[PDB]
Amino acid sequence: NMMVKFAGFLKPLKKTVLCIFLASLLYTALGIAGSFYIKFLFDDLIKFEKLNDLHIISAGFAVIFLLQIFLNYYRSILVTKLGMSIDKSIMMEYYSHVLKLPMNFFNSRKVGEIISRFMDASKIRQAISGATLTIMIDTIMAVIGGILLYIQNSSLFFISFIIILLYGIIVTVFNKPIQNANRQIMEDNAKLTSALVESVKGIETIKSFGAEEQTEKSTRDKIETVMKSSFKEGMLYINLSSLTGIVAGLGGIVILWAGAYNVIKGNMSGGQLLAFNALLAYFLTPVKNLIDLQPLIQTAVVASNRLGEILELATEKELREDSDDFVISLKGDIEFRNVDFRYGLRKPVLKNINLTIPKGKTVAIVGESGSGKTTLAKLLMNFYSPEKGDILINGHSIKNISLELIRKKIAFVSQDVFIFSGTVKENLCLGNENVDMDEIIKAAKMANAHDFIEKLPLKYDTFLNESGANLSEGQKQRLAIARALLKKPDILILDEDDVTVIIIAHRLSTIVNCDKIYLLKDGEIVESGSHTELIALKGCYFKMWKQTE
Amino acid sequence: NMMVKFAGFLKPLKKTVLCIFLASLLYTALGIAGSFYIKFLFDDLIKFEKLNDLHIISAGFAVIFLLQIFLNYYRSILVTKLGMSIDKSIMMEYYSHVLKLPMNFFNSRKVGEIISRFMDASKIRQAISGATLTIMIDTIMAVIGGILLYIQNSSLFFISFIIILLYGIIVTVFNKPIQNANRQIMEDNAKLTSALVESVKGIETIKSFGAEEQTEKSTRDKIETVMKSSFKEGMLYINLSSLTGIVAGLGGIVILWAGAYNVIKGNMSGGQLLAFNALLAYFLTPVKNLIDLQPLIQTAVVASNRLGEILELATEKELREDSDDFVISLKGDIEFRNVDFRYGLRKPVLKNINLTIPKGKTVAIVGESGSGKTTLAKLLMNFYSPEKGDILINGHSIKNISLELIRKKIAFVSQDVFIFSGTVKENLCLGNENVDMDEIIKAAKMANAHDFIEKLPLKYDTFLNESGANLSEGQKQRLAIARALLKKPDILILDEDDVTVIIIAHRLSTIVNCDKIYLLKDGEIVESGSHTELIALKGCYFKMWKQTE
Ligand SMILES: Nc1ncnc2c1ncn2[C@@H]1O[C@H](COP(=O)(O)OP(=O)(O)O)[C@@H](O)[C@H]1O
Ligand SMILES: Nc1ncnc2c1ncn2[C@@H]1O[C@H](COP(=O)(O)OP(=O)(O)O)[C@@H](O)[C@H]1O
């Protein structure tokens, strides 16, 4: 159904299509008129030795030809502009849809696969270029040439019709294997691209462990698979080309043979036969040219099908349920209620977890590694939806709150810090642009990131390489903290007056002054309270404290 | 030079090329023979009304054409195999070289740019194809057709020679513009791919800060540049194609005009002129097809130059000298002697470093963040070359030690952990795949990663998603510790049995039991010794201790 999207893209650009078709009509008419040059040369001028009329008629036919070139130039310009606009629209639609897909899509798929699927739009651009769509128009317009051929002679027209039927049979036979081979080679290319991206990202680890040769062998195996698919598709293309060449050449020879037979029988003159053979270039040649580009069209079709495969998935907002006047503030009691969650379909991470967080207080969540604390933090951020249960903020279900407010009023500071390629201010102004250079300074000073930025060659304007390679891991975390502080959130979640602070702590010694501490065990909260209370009743918190110390 | 590389690649294949050229010679002989059919049709059969010699001649020439198409099929298969081999060799060489470059290359470039340069080899593959490479063969073998055309008629041959000169003049002037347009479009595509990869990697941060629209605009501003470059190259191609079409059509019309004049004057006959026009397909059509293939050849040339730009950079082992023996034990006193270092051209990170680490001792390096601790660790791992300095391990220089030994006997555990897409066992076996399961289990037990691995659905075989998204971050750190422990190194470096353990710590509360503590201030060690000694000296370490606990 991607062709429906393309047609919708052609809905505003309509006068360009009409001009293209008028130019095609004029071009085809002039070519058909100029095909009679050999007939007028042999029947009238060579036979009668009319030298002067030869000169004038040849000059006139040379003049006629240039108009075809000018019209082809104009049509090619228009088609190139149309194709460029269509390709830009397709790429924007795909990218803008991908940027809002749920986190399951990004956790399941690989970066290289998505990047390759985006870059596959080059095939669509090639198929909608200025040299592949004019051939389609010529194939459509060959009806006029066929009508004129039928008027000129019925027998040779029927022979050309047999050639056309052979072309159609060949295309129908070969259409499916070609697209299957193209799909296979593009899947192999996607796998190779994923391996390439993964290898380049972790080059430091590969160098540290001396795994260059093993990585080379793995990439060599993937390249071998790619070349096997490439060879299969090349053999298919070679078979198609050989069959079409056989049909074209034998049809040309048979047409010349039957024309000679007709000329001997007196049903046609030699000039008429030559004119028919010339007009064949405006009847059969466009069709064969189209058949030549069948692999390219099929490749573009498969690429468009994959793009549509990504484009069918529902976005984050599509899976939402409602919104209302709850969008004022998230200040209140965060209350997980009978929350159950599982990642994909593995063992559940949280099993009937209930906890209430008082408003404006600094609470902390503890447990063993992998217990499901960052899972709670991501659930509070609506990155994943609980399997069953509710998460109430200020007495309102979090599903009824607009996702924009949830993402703007809750700040999550995880240890997977990401720094985008850009200036320090650009990194700190992510999603919160057009902020004056005073809030940024206040947040940087709060996050203790002011000093190292001021020590940089350009204060708050130093360009940062990809993934923050220009900074140490310590300063990168402070930049992340400052960026999250600029949000001015109602709920702040951190790893290691009226704003609620939730601390996901791994070391139990850091938090002894928290207002309330929650212990998570076996996917549920088993112990809660202050540090003194938790160490008093001699529970699992007491065991954890004694084991560590 | 990449042509030298192509010649070296083609040197082992001296049997395919000879067969290709012999098949090409036979193909051209049969194609030249067909023009004589087109001659005979209008001189002896039609004129004298021979209705049986016509059938015999037509059948014979159909047989000739069938042999010609079979030979073309065989040659195309051989050419396709040759091109596939060449492309595989090129890509494997490029990837093998890229995996060996120093860390400056990877810290200066971007993940998108390198992979874009890799995927730009598809254009070279398109250039060396089964339908493109035969066209150069036909062009170079058009010498036979030109000789026969000259033998047939001198004046029409001179007209065809003028046509070829016009083709050459046309293709000469568009060379640099087409090359520049292709280079610009490829650079813009590389930038777009870098932006795509960066956006996909950090999708979670974009979602958290609500920067979908900002990223959409940022990528739109790059898609627009790519489209502008594409439109410029499309207009250049349209101009070149229009000029080539003008030359071809006007040359054909002038050939027909001069042939008709010659026939009128009695210098030829109608059949001879038709034969000349037919044989022009083996002197002018190959040249015109080669001219029409210029965008592919130029694009492939630009891609090859882009690959060779990377291929010229020196690897790690090419910047080193000597691989002296007598060094198999990196268990001496690690010594930093007057070590100075700076990243790129910024301010120096280490200035006159002087420290010695006793062998088989657990030492700690501390200081504020950004002081140059991970820099020291990377210098020990020999990721970077210390300018104006010397690092000594036992009594030798780290420069005069095998890089494989250096990166096999020294293990570095950093704050960033990379988990490749694969099973847990395949991740613990990176670089060193030939180990028993007992050693892997022992290493996992020492790193405390055995329990959560056993709790996994398939133990040490569970597939881990890209970047270890299937596990917790706390579970990934223990996995990397086990991976580093499997090396059985002589030096172990940790970012918080005579093995030397170096602990890079940010908190002084966790290293008070270490043998010696190194404090790094202003790029040099100012305080060294034990914790008690450092407290007694009442130095900078004492101030840091008083500030926190
Ligand atoms: N992206 C993911 N996909 C599938 N499973 C996951 C993912 N992230 C975490 N898990 C699983 O959920 C559990 C909870 O881990 P997590 O909450 O990250 O631990 P912690 O709270 O200690 O950081 C882990 O055992 C892990 O196996
Ligand atoms: N890959 C790099 N490229 C350029 N500069 C860097 C790079 N890594 C670190 N630096 C700079 O060198 C200094 C030393 O940082 P680093 O040694 O990583 O800190 P730490 O010792 O706390 O780990 C930092 O201020 C940082 O700006």
Instruction: Give the relative orientation of helices A294-311 and A284-292 as an angle to the nearest 10 degrees.
Output: 50
Q: Which helix (H) or strand (E) holds A164?
A: helix A154-201
Identify residue A519 by its one-letter amino acid code: L
- Do residue A224 and residue A338 come from a single domain? no
Ligand positioned closest to the Cα atom of B204: 1
* CA of B207 vs chain A CAs: smallest distance (Å): 7
In a domain, A321, yes or no: no
Q: How far apart are CA A295 and CA A301, in angstroms?
A: 10
Q: Which of A345, A346, A375 to mutate to test the pocket of ligand 1 (most atoms within 8 A of CB)?
A: A375
How far apart are alpha carbons A188 and A302 in whole angstroms? 14
Residue A49's SS3 state is: coil
Measure the CA–CA gap between A130 and A547, rounded to whole angstroms.
74
State the residue range of the domain holding A402. 334-548
* A119, B193 contact by CB (below 8 A): yes
DSSP state of B122: H
Cα maximum dimension of chain B? 123
Give the separation between CA B307 and CA A301, rounded to whole angstroms.
30
- In degrees and rounded to multiples of 5, residue B359 shows phi and psi of -70, 145
Measured from the Cβ of residue A522, the count of other Cβ atoms closer than 10 Å reads 12
List B residues 34-73 in contact with A (Cβ-Cβ < 8 A).
37-38, 41-42, 45-46, 49-51, 54-55, 58, 61-62, 65-66, 68-69, 72-73
Q: How many CB atoms sit inside 10 A of residue B22's CB?
A: 12
- Amino acid type, A167: Y
**In terms of domains, do B115 and B223 share one?**
yes
Please give the order of strands across the beta sheet that includes A334-341. Answer: A350-357, A334-341, A388-393, A396-397
* Paired tokens of B199: 């956006």
Distance CA A142, CA A138 (A): 6
Closest listed residue to residue A141, CA positions, set A243, A22, A233: A22
Q: Are B535 and B512 in contact (CB under 8 A)?
A: no
Please name the residues between 383 and 412 in chain A that touch chain B, using a CB distance below 8 Å.
383, 404, 407-408, 411-412
Q: CA–CA separation, A138 vs A29, rounded Å?
A: 11
Cβ–ligand 1 contact at B469 (below 6 Å) = yes
Whether B471 lines ligand 1, by a CB cut-off of 6 Å, is yes
Taking phi first (over 0 means left), then psi (-120 to 50 degrees means alpha), and beta for anything else, what does residue A139 get?
alpha
Does a structural domain hold residue B415? no
Question: Mutate which of B204, B417, B452, B486 to disrupt the A interface (most A C-beta within 10 Å)?
Answer: B204
Write down the H helix ranges in B132-269: 133-152, 154-173, 175-201, 203-209, 212-265
Q: How far is CA A332 from CA A233, A352, A491, in A?
A: 62, 22, 9
Tell me whether residue A317 is in a domain.
Answer: no
- Closest partner residue to A407 among B55, B210, B242, by Cβ? B210
Q: What is the DSSP letter of A280?
A: G
A127, A300 Cβ separation under 8 angstroms = yes
Counting every residue, how long is chain B? 549
In a domain, A328, yes or no: no
Angle among Cα A199, A205, A210 to the nearest 5 degrees reads: 95
Angle at which helices B212-265 and B285-292 cross, to 10°: 170
Beta strands in B377-490 (DSSP E): 390-392, 410-413, 422-423, 463-464
How far apart CA A232 and CA B542 sit, in angstroms, is 72
Domain boundary at B315, B343, B366, which? B315
Q: Which residues pair with A339 in a beta bridge?
A: A353
Q: Are residue B247 and residue B343 in the same domain, yes or no?
A: no
Structure tokens at B47: 């004129």
B204 neighbourhood in chain A, CB within 8 Å: 103, 106, 383, 416, 418
CA distances A93 to A107, A118, A341, A393, B32, Å, are 22, 11, 33, 35, 53
Q: Which residues of B are annotated as a binding site for ADP?
A: 107, 343, 346, 370-375, 415, 469-470, 472
B338 interfacial to chain A (CB closer than 8 Å):
no
Q: How far apart are CA B53 and CA B36, in angstroms?
A: 15
Two tokens at B176?
A: 């640099």
Q: B106–A431: do the CB atoms touch at under 8 Å?
A: no
- The partner residue sitting opposite A118, judged by closest CB among B107, B196, B208, is B196
Alpha helices of B266-329 — where are they, by DSSP H?
Answer: 270-279, 285-292, 294-311
Give chain A positions within 8 Å (CB) of B474: 369-370, 506
Return the SS3 of B253. helix
Distances (CA, A) of B84 to A196, A233, A449, B19, B243: 20, 12, 54, 17, 33
Residue A124 sits in the same domain as residue A268: yes
Same domain, B361 and B446: no
Shared domain for B330 and B459, answered yes or no, is no
Which residues of chain B lie closer than 8 angstroms to A506, CB-CB? 474
What would the 3-class secondary structure string for A80-120 be? Answer: HHHHHHHHHHHHHHHHHHHCCCCHHHHHHCCHHHHHHHHHC
The answer to whether B115 contacts A87, with C-beta atoms less than 8 Å apart, is: no
In a domain, B384, yes or no: yes
SS3 A515: coil
B487, B510, B529 - which closes a domain: B487
Question: Which residue in B108, B250, B472 is closest to A370 by CB distance?
Answer: B472
Same domain, B495 and B461: no
Q: What is the CATH number of the domain that holds B9?
A: 1.20.1560.10
Which residue type is seen at A42?
F
In terms of domains, do A435 and A294 share one?
no
Rounded Cα gap, residues A35 and A275, in angstroms: 6
Which of B440, B458, B487 is the endpoint of a domain?
A: B487
**B474, A370 Cβ separation under 8 angstroms:** yes
B445 plus B359 within the same structural domain? no
Q: Which residues 349-368 of A have a C-beta within 8 angstroms of B?
A: none
CA pseudo-torsion sign A228, A229, A235, A241:
negative
Q: Determine which residue's CA is closest to atom 6 belonging to ligand 1.
A: B470
Ligand 2 contacts CB of residue A154 (under 6 A): no
Distance CA B99, CA A338 (A): 51
For residue B66, which amino acid is it? Answer: L
* Structural domains of chain B, count: 3
B/e letters for A342-372, b = 16+ CB within 10 Å, e = fewer, are beeeeeebbeebebebebeebbbbbbebbbb
From the list B253, B412, B483, the residue facing A58 with the nearest CB is B253
Chain A residue numbers with beta carbons less than 8 Å from the beta carbon of B467 are: 201
Nearest to A23 by CA among A165, A137, A124: A137
B534 near B517, Cβ under 8 Å? yes
Residue A322 belongs to some domain of the structure: no
Are A349 and A226 part of one and the same domain?
no
Inter-chain touch A200–B106, beta carbons under 8 Å: yes
What is the largest distance, in Å, between two alpha-carbon atoms of chain A? 123
Nearest Cα neighbor of B488 from B436, B411, B412 is B411
CATH at A338? 3.40.50.300
DSSP code, position A369: T
The C-alpha of A85 sits at a distance from chain B's nearest C-alpha, in angstroms, of 8
In this structure, the answer to whether residues B241 and B381 fall within a common structural domain is: no
User: Tokens 């057709």 map to which residue?
Assistant: B145
Q: Residue A276 and residue A282: Cα distance in Å, rounded?
A: 10
Residue A326 lies in a domain: no
Tokens of B79: 């050419």
A528-to-A31, A354, A544 alpha-carbon distances in Å: 88, 11, 14
Report the structure determination method.
cryo-EM
Distance A366 CA to ligand 1 centre (A): 14
Identify whether residues B495 and B478 lie together within a single domain.
no
Q: How far is the CA of B448 from the centre of ligand 2 (A)?
A: 30
Helix (H, G, I), strand (E, B) or coil at A448: coil
CA dist., res. B262 & res. B259, Å (int): 5
SS3 state of residue A256: helix
Q: Which residue, among A413, A421, A435, A420, has the nearest Cα to A480 in the 3D structure?
A: A413
Cβ contact A431–B69 (<8 Å): no
The structure tokens 């201010």 sit at A425
Residue that has been written with the tokens 């990528």 in this structure: B219
Residue whose entry in the numeric block shows the structure tokens 């919708």: A8
Resolution for the entry shown, Å? 3.1
Domain assignment present for residue A316? The answer is no
Neighbour count for residue B148 (Cβ, 10 Å): 17
Q: Which residues lie below 8 Å from residue A473, measured CB to CB, with a gap of 6+?
A: A417, B374, B414, B415, B416
Chain A residue with CA closest to B478: the answer is A369
